[PDB]
Amino acid sequence: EDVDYEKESKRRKLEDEDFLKLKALEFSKDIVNEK
């Protein structure tokens, strides 16, 4: 048993280290203008 959260908190830290990457997909030029 390890009731505490620090393991998952470290997981969050890793995820936040990844978090910036998604923005490129979020905002880069897009294949088509549907309109």
């Binding site: 048993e1 390890d2 009731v3 505490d4 959260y5 620090e6």
Partner: protein
């Protein structure tokens, strides 16, 4: 019959209990046996009334941070036993050192409980806190334990812990404990609830088999456990002194250090301010010492040789305020194997003040002399024995008008190219490193030096002394 002991032996009782005894030989045999029983904690064997009397005697010896007490159950259930308030803690500059946030002025208690190891158990305390309150949001639970807006909370922490001192700066650890971490409690309602809870934790560490004491955790009543060890010194001669006058102490110090020994050791025991004490209790305490306690080495600003004044080594001579307010000067046979309070390596000695050298007000390690109109800074050592100070003023720094063909040798550090201020190395009696401030027309073999390239010790002093204010 219940095991019982006389009032007077409370001396031993407290001694052993509170300061983390190691030796057991020199306590009188029967009281020692009784104490052993008590440490075995078989409460049933001992009279309660004895205990209540002892506690009232402790109320007489009015230790400050005692938790108010009303029942013997303090010995038989988890309870707080000392009381504290959150100090300012209001600084941002350095790291939090995992000193988690507390609301300013939060009241605090220390438990009677110590554990070898966190994280194995605290789920139990979590369940208890779940009892204490039903609805909860966003508890700041952590490794150490419950936190919620500070407020209600608890944590394991080491014994001697300061509250709300602004740092935990690095220092070596001396001591060892089976159960290093006492629990501490935050939020008064928790302690209030525990007045009713009247409980002891389950102890599966011992299979819950009704064991008085447990492999991983242990109650102690008011155990502070400060370091201690027996005096063993080969006493040669002694004297006792009663006074409050500091200048008087310095006069005694001078009188003594007209003796030949280069240096004197001096100590102050730490606990002296804690409460009232029986003089007999002080007498017992004298034969033990605390390795953490503050100690100093001090010497005169040695000038020159009296050829007769030599060979004293056999005498080792030391002083301490064995009493809060009184002192017990001692001569002993010079010895190696005797042991003393721990001091960090390379610690500077102290130089006793000279009766014509004036410590700068609000400073250390620096002084001025009038007869030659000179300012002086110790390279390393720390002033001692001053009673009065002179504040710095720039007018003191009279620059010299001397004829231009000046010359100098050794390191020059320019202080101000404009005000023609400089610093140069010197050694008093070819033995004490120091630096000399100077101002005016002066010259060297070029070789300019940068303020960057110097000891922080002198540097901070200079930084204040410039007084850009």
């Amino acid at each position: 019959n219940l095991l019982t002991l006389e009032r007077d032996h409370f001396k031993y009782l407290f001694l052993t209990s509170y300061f983390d005894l190691k030796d057991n030989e020199h306590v009188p045999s029967e009281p020692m046996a009784f104490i052993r029983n008590y440490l075995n904690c078989t409460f049933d064997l001992l009279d309660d009334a004895v205990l209540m009397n002892y506690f009232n005697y402790l109320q007489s010896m009015q230790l400050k941070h005692l938790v108010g007490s009303t029942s013997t159950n303090i010995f038989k259930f988890v309870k707080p036993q000392f009381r504290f308030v959150c100090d300012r803690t209001t600084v941002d500059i350095l790291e939090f050192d995992t000193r988690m946030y507390i609301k300013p002025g939060t009241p605090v208690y220390a438990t009677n409980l110590f554990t070898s190891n966190p994280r194995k158990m605290m789920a139990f305390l979590y369940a208890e806190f779940g009892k204490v309150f039903k609805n909860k949001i966003f508890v700041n639970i952590n490794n150490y334990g419950c936190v919620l807006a500070g407020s209600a909370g608890f944590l394991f922490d080491d014994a001697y812990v300061d509250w709300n001192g602004v740092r935990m700066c690095a220092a070596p650890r001396l001591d060892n404990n089976m159960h290093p971490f006492r629990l501490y409690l935050l939020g008064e309602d928790m302690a209030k609830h525990f007045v009713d809870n009247n409980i002891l934790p389950p102890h599966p560490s011992n299979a819950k088999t009704r064991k008085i004491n447990n492999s991983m955790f242990m109650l102690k009543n008011f155990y502070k456990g400060l370091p201690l060890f027996k005096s063993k010194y080969t006493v040669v001669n002694s004297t006792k002194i009663v006074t409050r006058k500091p200048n008087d102490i310095f006069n005694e110090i001078d009188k003594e250090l007209n003796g030949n020994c280069p240096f004197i050791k001096f100590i102050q025991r730490d606990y002296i301010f804690d409460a009232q004490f029986p003089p007999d209790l002080l007498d017992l305490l004298n034969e033990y010492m605390t390795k953490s306690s503050i100690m100093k080495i001090i010497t005169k600003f040695v000038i020159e040789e009296n050829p007769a004044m030599s060979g004293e080594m056999s005498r080792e001579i030391i002083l301490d305020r064995y009493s809060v307010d009184n002192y017990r000067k001692l001569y002993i046979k010079m010895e190696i194997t005797n042991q003393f309070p721990v001091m960090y390596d390379h610690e500077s000695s102290y130089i006793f003040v000279s009766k014509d050298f004036l410590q700068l007000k609000g400073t250390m390690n620096a002084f001025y002399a009038p007869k030659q109109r000179i300012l002086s800074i110790l390279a390393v050592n720390r002033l001692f024995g001053a009673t009065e100070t002179i504040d710095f003023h720039p007018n003191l720094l009279v620059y010299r008008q001397s004829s231009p063909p000046v010359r100098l040798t050794g390191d020059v550090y320019v202080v101000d190219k404009n005000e023609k201020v400089f610093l140069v190395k010197h050694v008093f009696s070819n033995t004490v490193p120091a630096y000399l401030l100077i101002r005016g027309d002066y010259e060297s073999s070029s070789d300019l030096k940068s303020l960057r390239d110097l000891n922080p010790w002198v540097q901070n002093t200079l930084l204040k002394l410039l007084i850009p204010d």
